[PDB]
nitric oxide synthase oxygenase
Amino acid sequence: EEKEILWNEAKAFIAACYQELGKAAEVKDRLADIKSEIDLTGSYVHTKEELEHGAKMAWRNSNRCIGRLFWNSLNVIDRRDVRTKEEVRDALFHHIETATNNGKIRPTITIFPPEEKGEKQVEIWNHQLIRYAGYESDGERIGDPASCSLTAACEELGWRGERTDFDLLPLIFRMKGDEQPVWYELPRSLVIEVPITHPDIEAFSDLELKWYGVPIISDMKLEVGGIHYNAAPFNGWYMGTEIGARNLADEKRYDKLKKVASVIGIAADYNTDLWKDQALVELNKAVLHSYKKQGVSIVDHHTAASQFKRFEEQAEEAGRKLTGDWTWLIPPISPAATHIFHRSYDNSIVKPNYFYQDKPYE
Amino acid sequence: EEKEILWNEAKAFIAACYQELGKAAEVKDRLADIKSEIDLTGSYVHTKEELEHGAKMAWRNSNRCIGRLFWNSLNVIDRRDVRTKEEVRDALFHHIETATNNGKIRPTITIFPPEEKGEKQVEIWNHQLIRYAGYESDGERIGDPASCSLTAACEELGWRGERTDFDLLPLIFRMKGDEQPVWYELPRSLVIEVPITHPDIEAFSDLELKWYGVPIISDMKLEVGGIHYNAAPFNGWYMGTEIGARNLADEKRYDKLKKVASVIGIAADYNTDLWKDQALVELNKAVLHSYKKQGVSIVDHHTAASQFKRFEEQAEEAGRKLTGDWTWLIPPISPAATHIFHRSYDNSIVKPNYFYQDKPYE
Ligand code: HEM
Ligand code: HEM
Ligand SMILES: CCN(CCc1cccc(F)c1)Cc1cccc(NC(=N)c2cccs2)c1
Ligand SMILES: CCN(CCc1cccc(F)c1)Cc1cccc(NC(=N)c2cccs2)c1
Ligand SMILES: C[C@H](O)[C@H](O)[C@H]1CNc2nc(N)[nH]c(=O)c2N1
Ligand SMILES: C[C@H](O)[C@H](O)[C@H]1CNc2nc(N)[nH]c(=O)c2N1
Ligand SMILES: [Cl-]
Ligand SMILES: [Cl-]
């Protein structure tokens, strides 16, 4: 059943990919090559072209992603050659540097060897390559609660955080054949961070908020023609609401709205004053302002939705079915001010795609 | 098949209703009565208790409604006795007066005779009993575009609007046996309207915005134990976002955000300034402030979501399955600031319930 699922996914992916690449005549012979390679080895190896286009298709098919207009410009780095933990570390460090690009963020994915027997070659423990630690002691919370369990697992491995609200977690990953992951502190020269200030309200800096420049998701599986690349970190740039309306605002995250209300000079006493809404808007204005001022890429939710509308128009004109998850595509502030809120989307799963996988800790 | 659908719905409703009313022992004999009444007449007549509880259950089962905590206090007015158009008019006028209650809004439903052969006895054309007209001429828009087609149909019947942005549509409805609906101008003494002012920004009144106090939906079918009450207008009070974030804000409605930005003193030039978001928050603050100042009931979306959380807790403790439509329950501003955004809901249809029906015009 395994070779069979693999062969079926392979046939479908190659046909579609080669059709998109104008290589339809090559499908028959490539599929023959593949079928015998599966017969003899139990798997097959993608060409560089397939791997690159596969990763781009996978982004294009990500139902929850508002940023998909730019799917065809994904920078794909092929690291299927790595064998050692130093090589993995250096490839992750490199991804950070080249994706960051001095603030002008380049959407990039680095692809490591794929699972074999469902056996991982490289197992990345981080949720994102750059993220902040979280702690709970004396019922007192420090840092990012979403990082609590991974932070605890790193401290089990001999790492120790400074317990600021913004400790950078080390890279942490396990190699096939090793019982424990290794961890490596991030060089600070590689990590751009943005202090959050407000364009008009000077007191806003009293909150001492900041966030990191580049979100690099490192715990999803890329699936392409039946091959499972469980280790394939990827980044875009942030949409400002992700930081201003969720990471810094959620009660179960940094929970800053009451403090925001206070520095912007409004009472946080009555639901009918809409103080949370007002605090949310000023915090989100500050986030966009701060990234722009530092020369770090970011997009506001209005511009992002306009780009997404173009993606829809592009799909239609290319004759491709559009799929989407309305509940994730609407931004968490003023969603009815975007066109997204007012239409519906088919939430069917199309492959290639990025998928959740079980955490190796907790 | 018709008597069969009716009998099946009847059995289910009576059992459930009598169980809730502590009258389980009466179900067997009531169902016998019903079965022969259906045999002999093709239908059956609800007792006053069934009709009242049926309407309350229908509200409780409305997946899209955030205001359901208060389902058991619905005021049910039984007007199954009406036979004449004057009687219908006077019952609609009465509903407006008693629901409005001098500003302290009472959730009320008036129930007219139900369909017989699928033949309507009373056919109400209005979407709400109180709503504003809409016009399009010279490509120039006046009033509420959502009312354009009904406005055109009323003007076909000899009504003429003044073409202000807030013309009250007449009541318009058709009686069984009549080829055309009749229309009746609303007495202005019955209609509370609220001028929109802002608690801090004096210039806000320059926009000359207002809205009506009481939303009274008059075009949905109430279905209870297989009986189709196509004419059964009902009201609650407004949640402020319905007015401030949609009716007055949508581009296809009153489209006021640019004007709002202007009177609150912000530029409406750059997406990254989040001027639409900021305008939305100030407009919504003004709406809540204005209703409160006039002594007309209204609820903000934070309080409404807290009430809805109680409805969920109440369902669970009563052992009732909860159903809901996440896409409609989230408010259109700051939805991630409510608990609703962060959980999921079963969108199954349970009866009794309120349903859309085809418009008799257009
Ligand atoms: C270029 C700028 C990009 C922007 C502005 C953007 C925007 C977003 C946003 C706002 C989300 C929702 C995240 C959340 O609420 O937690 C998202 C989800 C997602 N994006 Fe994108 N994205 C971009 C690029 C990319 C790239 C390069 C990929 C992969 C190649 C990608 C794949 C995804 C996936 C898989 C999700 C869903 C994550 C999940 O289900 O948890 N995106 N995107
Ligand atoms: C008491 C105060 C109430 C509040 C604050 C409230 C709130 C709301 C809101 C905000 C909506 C969404 C409307 C839209 O976006 O167009 C809604 C939908 C709805 N409500 Fe309520 N509601 C209340 C009372 C009632 C009552 C008394 C009934 C009937 C007995 C009712 C039945 C419904 C139904 C059927 C819908 C869905 C309409 C549709 O699908 O188009 N509600 N409610
Ligand atoms: C933690 C919140 N987001 C994912 C939600 C999640 C993740 C892991 C486990 C969960 F249960 C839920 C993170 C995320 C995912 C995808 C995109 C983004 N935002 C971005 N702009 C990008 C990150 C990488 C490419 S684009 C954030
Ligand atoms: C026109 C927008 N709303 C319904 C959407 C709709 C209506 C008719 C046809 C459509 F295609 C779509 C109106 C509505 C419906 C239900 C409740 C409310 N708001 C209220 N607070 C109440 C009105 C009546 C009881 S509560 C508004
Ligand atoms: C239950 C609900 O679907 C869930 O909490 C979602 C809602 N939509 C979302 N949308 C985005 N973009 N990100 C999120 O974390 C969530 N949370
Ligand atoms: C397509 C989408 O589901 C639709 O436009 C909805 C979204 N959620 C909504 N929710 C409410 N309460 N009211 C609405 O009119 C809408 N519009
Ligand atoms: Cl994030
Ligand atoms: Cl309305």
Chain B has three domains: 1-80+107-117+221-235+305-329, 81-106+121-192+356-360, 193-215+238-303. The first strand of chain B starts at residue 75 and ends at 78.
